[PDB]
Design a binder for this molecule. Structure first.
Ligand SMILES: *CC(=O)c1ccc2c(Nc3ccccc3)ncnc2c1
Length: 267
């Protein structure tokens, strides 16, 4: 049933084909586990496959199937042509209209609205975890495939790795991970999108980021970013987590900007 085609990255992420008795052949992404898999590693990989299988939404990565009967174990998903959002934007620097970028952000927010409705807290919302297809539809993902190892994207923190640049201050400080801390991460995703995949906080060290945020520093609007979009980022980054908009309100605000495109001209 599963046929491999080419290796993408390093277990490993590969491209291939899948055929089931009743449905037509579709291109798939195959997440494999490294040779000589441990009982705990196999349990962690399958518990991740079980999470993805619970969801069904046009802005959430679709799980096509899972291989359990034969080694190596596999996670099969629908192949997303344009790969990760951050890498896709960096090579397409200034090649999209504001409306297209807003549509991408609306898709991400619709996916996040669905997750929050299912009572699921993502914890790692970032442009590197958003996949893009040929039609520019953005899909929220996780458990898939480094600018400076001195200021790593993830910090080895006791219980688990934390991406400091994308994490709400209360989730860094007290591990208070909620849909509101995912909204903070979404605000960082908005900034990554409007900047065509720049590194949040630039040269600032990871410790500088925590200190600056605590002292009310907020990322400036990227070049040519409409004021309304930046204001929405600032709303996502309220220190009071109760005042941050819900994903349903973000979707509503983005739709209001799409209906009134003149508001996307004000820079
Ligand atoms: C285009 C490209 O490089 C790419 C990379 C990874 C993908 C994934 N990853 C994934 C597989 C299994 C579980 C979670 C994420 N899925 C779909 N398309 C791509 C495309």
């Amino acid at each position: 049933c599963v046929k491999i085609e080419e290796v993408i990255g390093a277990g490993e992420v590969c491209r291939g084909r899948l055929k089931q008795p009743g449905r037509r052949e579709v291109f798939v992404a195959i997440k494999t586990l490294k040779v000589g898999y441990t009982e705990r590693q196999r349990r962690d990989f399958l518990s991740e496959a079980s999470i993805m299988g619970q969801f069904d939404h046009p802005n959430i990565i679709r799980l096509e199937g899972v291989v359990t009967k034969s080694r190596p174990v596999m996670i099969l998903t629908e192949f997303m042509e344009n790969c990760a959002l951050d890498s896709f934007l960096r090579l397409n620097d200034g090649q999209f209209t504001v409306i297209q970028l807003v549509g991408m952000l609306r898709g991400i927010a619709a996916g996040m609205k669905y997750l929050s409705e299912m009572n699921y807290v993502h914890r790692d919302l970032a442009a590197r975890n958003i996949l893009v297809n040929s039609n520019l539809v953005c899909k929220v993902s996780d458990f898939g495939l480094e600018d400076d190892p001195s200021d790593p994207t993830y910090t080895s923190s006791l219980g688990g790795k934390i991406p400091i640049r994308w994490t709400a201050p209360e989730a860094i400080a007290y591990r208070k991970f909620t849909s509101a801390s995912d909204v903070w991460s979404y605000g960082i995703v908005m900034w990554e999108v409007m900047s065509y995949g720049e590194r949040p906080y630039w040269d600032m060290s990871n410790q500088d980021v925590i200190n600056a945020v605590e002292q009310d520093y907020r990322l400036p609007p990227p070049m040519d970013c409409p004021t309304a979009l930046h204001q929405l980022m600032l709303d996502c980054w309220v220190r009071d987590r109760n005042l941050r908009p819900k994903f349903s309100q973000i979707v509503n605000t983005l739709d209001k900007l799409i209906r009134n495109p003149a508001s996307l001209k004000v820079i």
